[PDB]
From Swiss-Prot:
Protein name per the record: Glucagon
Tissues expressing this chain: Secreted in the A cells of the islets of Langerhans.
Modified-residue entries (Phosphoserine), positions: S1
Summary of the function given for this chain in its UniProt record: Plays a key role in glucose metabolism and homeostasis. Regulates blood glucose by increasing gluconeogenesis and decreasing glycolysis. A counterregulatory hormone of insulin, raises plasma glucose levels in response to insulin-induced hypoglycemia. Plays an important role in initiating and maintaining hyperglycemic conditions in diabetes.
Induction data: Release is stimulated by hypoglycemia and inhibited by hyperglycemia, insulin, and somatostatin.
Top-rank taxon: Eukaryota
Range within the parent protein: 54 to 81 of 180
Organism annotation: Homo sapiens (Human)
Spans traversing the lipid bilayer: none
Disulfide-linked positions: none
Length: 28
């Protein structure tokens, strides 16, 4: 099963996506 490295990397990717969304929400 995915270890801490892979799971933490996925949380990092999720953080990038969520920040992506934050930016989109402000865009016009």
């Amino acid at each position: 099963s995915q270890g801490t490295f892979t799971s933490d990397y996925s949380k990092y990717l999720d953080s990038r996506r969520a920040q992506x969304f934050v930016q989109w929400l402000m865009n016009t």
